[PDB]
Design an enzyme around this catalytic site. Structure first.
Site, short mmCIF file in Angstrom:
data_model
loop_
_atom_site.label_atom_id
_atom_site.label_comp_id
_atom_site.label_asym_id
_atom_site.label_seq_id
_atom_site.Cartn_x
_atom_site.Cartn_y
_atom_site.Cartn_z
N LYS B 140 0.84 -1.19 0.00
CA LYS B 140 0.00 0.00 0.00
C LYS B 140 0.88 1.25 0.00
CE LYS B 140 -4.21 -1.39 2.53
NZ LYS B 140 -5.00 -1.07 3.75
N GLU B 238 -5.31 -5.53 11.11
CA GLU B 238 -5.88 -4.28 11.59
C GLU B 238 -6.28 -4.47 13.04
OE1 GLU B 238 -6.06 -1.40 10.02
OE2 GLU B 238 -5.25 -2.23 8.16
#
Ligand SMILES: O=S([O-])[O-]
Ligand SMILES: O=S([O-])[O-]
Ligand SMILES: [Co+2]
Ligand SMILES: [Co+2]
Ligand SMILES: [Co+2]
Ligand SMILES: [Co+2]
Lengths: 352, 353
Positions: B140, B238
């Protein structure tokens, strides 16, 4: 007409016909997107922008974002500004970017859509014949840098494309000609004995009916996708669509806006045909075939060698060449043939 | 040590050990690139940058490009400026971008390399334990807008990654700890070391860090090799980030990302237990492992619960990644996102730790 366009596994429906926007509700479910950000550079006719907004507004709320047209403003700064504004309007992962305009609008909206949240839906509504028959059939996106044109970008496919042939048939002749130059290019590099039109259907005035352009668009879809469906990045066989661009690009720059991209590429193909001949690859007859076909669309009508050669810039430079009409020349299993810098400059010197 | 990392069919070699750069020649072929453009934000020690330039220079000309560090400068504008300078130095498709620094430099250099000529080689030389064991193990890339962090970017893999463990072992303890918090996270959601090798001073030998890095590579890639976009099973990384990120923002820099995530994990465990999804023994395991790395010792928590709530939500449920036990993610509707009543979230944030 509606054709499915697939770049590898990423596909999208391409509808083109008269008043196609008056039917967006039949290609896009109203639940797909929750908002439409319509982007169009200033050079685009308001009537078209408002026309498109009226029909997309039937699916969800539409917000029009205009920006200063011109190659001088096609930058990341403009993209950033559009993104900031899109967010202030509540843009999210369910929002869709609708690019209404020519190639410049397509690229700016394309880079914008590709970066927001790392990628949101891009919808193209091509208003020029060049964009609808060529640039929209490519997933390359890019904007300029102070030091060069289209030096920053990436590859990003759209989710829908709508081309209104009525609008296209009413665009200026010269602008139509620029797209026709690329179509003739497709006729020169690919073999196709089954077209829905003959050379007798081409005119130098560059004035066509909605249906005639629909046929042209259908022909380009078949020509380019027959190759790009696999070579998505246009780095292999796809390089063939770069015919006439090596020197064409340099000429386009040298003229500083005086000639269209199409006209520049047209002169670029002729110079490429001559070069292939001087190199024992292409018969003189095929050279003439280049002039003949280009004159049929009046490509050489509205048209310094040292200047041209400078922008162009080892004794060799790679070029895409042909051994004959519809027959690309290979080199080391590649479409790039090394060519003598001194030969290229000499041909440019001889002129048309 | 060298490990082949692959996000789908996009692979790259990750070499790590003492003075791995001093032997870059044996890792990268001489004709691979004709130029190296080193990018490093201003907060990165000059000694490290010049050190890396000396060895990459043995392969091809090296130019150093610095930029203003700080979240304020992680923007597309900063990227554009770096791209113009690289072009002025004659950058081309045979050029490689070398990002020497932490997460900030990684993202800025990443977006820059990914866009130049529609994509040129990106090589990472992580200078922080957090970047070397976590952020470079993700493709990312992103920068901020004035209206939001990481709102513009894309996915772009590197060609090579070099982590000098000597440099990492000399980095500040609080920096090491932040990455250690992510390592603990990996241990809880899913090795050549035991809990005995963890210390609360966060001072480690190059060798011990090499072992930690190997563990993180194996753990993250067991999931990300297939979920390159981290939108499915990859959401597991996460863990502790939903409320954790709100807290990090609320603290305006008072706490490190790791510290914020450590607190976020304690909250997720309590919530999982309060929803009858996780036994108390598993909750205690969270405190135990985090206390071994001293993650809950300092923590200058100053912001109020209302501020945290604000950054968290800006409906009676929020989705969170929860566990039913250590190593056992809680599934909901075939997704890792379990709906959680605002009630429980506000309660845990209000009570603190
Ligand atoms: O311009 S193409 O022929 O190399
Ligand atoms: O913060 S995670 O646990 O949703
Ligand atoms: Co062209
Ligand atoms: Co950094
Ligand atoms: Co994290
Ligand atoms: Co993730």
């Amino acid at each position: 007409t509606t054709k499915q366009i697939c770049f590898a596994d990423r596909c999208f429906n391409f509808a083109f016909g008269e008043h196609v926007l008056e039917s967006v509700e039949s290609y896009i479910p109203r639940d797909e997107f929750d908002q439409y950000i319509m982007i169009s550079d200033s050079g685009v006719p308001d009537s078209i922008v408002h026309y498109a907004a009226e029909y997309f507004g039937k699916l969800a709320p539409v917000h029009i974002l205009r920006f200063q047209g011109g190659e001088e403003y096609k930058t990341l700064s403009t993209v950033t500004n559009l993104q900031e504004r899109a967010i202030a309007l509540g843009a999210n992962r369910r929002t869709a970017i609708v690019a209404v305009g020519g190639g410049l609008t397509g690229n700016v909206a394309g880079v914008a859509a590709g970066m927001m949240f790392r990628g949101i839906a891009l919808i193209h509504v091509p208003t020029t014949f060049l964009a609808a028959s060529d640039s929209v059939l490519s997933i390359k996106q890019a904007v300029n840098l102070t030091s060069g044109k289209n030096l920053v970008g990436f590859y990003y496919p759209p989710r829908f494309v709508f081309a209104d042939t009525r609008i296209l048939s009413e665009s200026p002749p010269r602008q139509v000609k620029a797209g026709m130059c690329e179509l003739v290019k497709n006729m020169l590099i690919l073999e196709n004995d089954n077209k829905e039109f003959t050379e007798d259907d081409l005119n130098s005035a560059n004035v066509y009916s909605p249906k005639q352009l629909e046929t042209f668009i259908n022909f380009c879809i078949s020509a380019k996708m027959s190759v790009l469906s696999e070579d998505i990045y246009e780095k292999k066989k796809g390089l063939i669509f770069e015919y006439g661009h090596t020197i064409g690009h340099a000429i386009e720059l040298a003229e500083q806006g005086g000639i269209t991209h199409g006209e520049a590429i047209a002169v670029g193909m002729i110079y490429a045909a001559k070069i292939a001949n001087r190199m024992n690859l292409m018969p003189e007859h095929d050279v003439s075939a280049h002039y003949w076909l280009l004159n049929k669309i009046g490509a050489l009508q509205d048209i310094d060698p040292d200047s041209i050669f400078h922008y162009l810039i080892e004794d060799n430079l790679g070029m895409i060449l042909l051994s004959g009409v519809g027959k690309p020349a290979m080199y080391n299993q590649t479409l790039l043939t090394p060519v003598r810098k001194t030969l290229i400059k000499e041909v440019i010197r001889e002129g048309l």
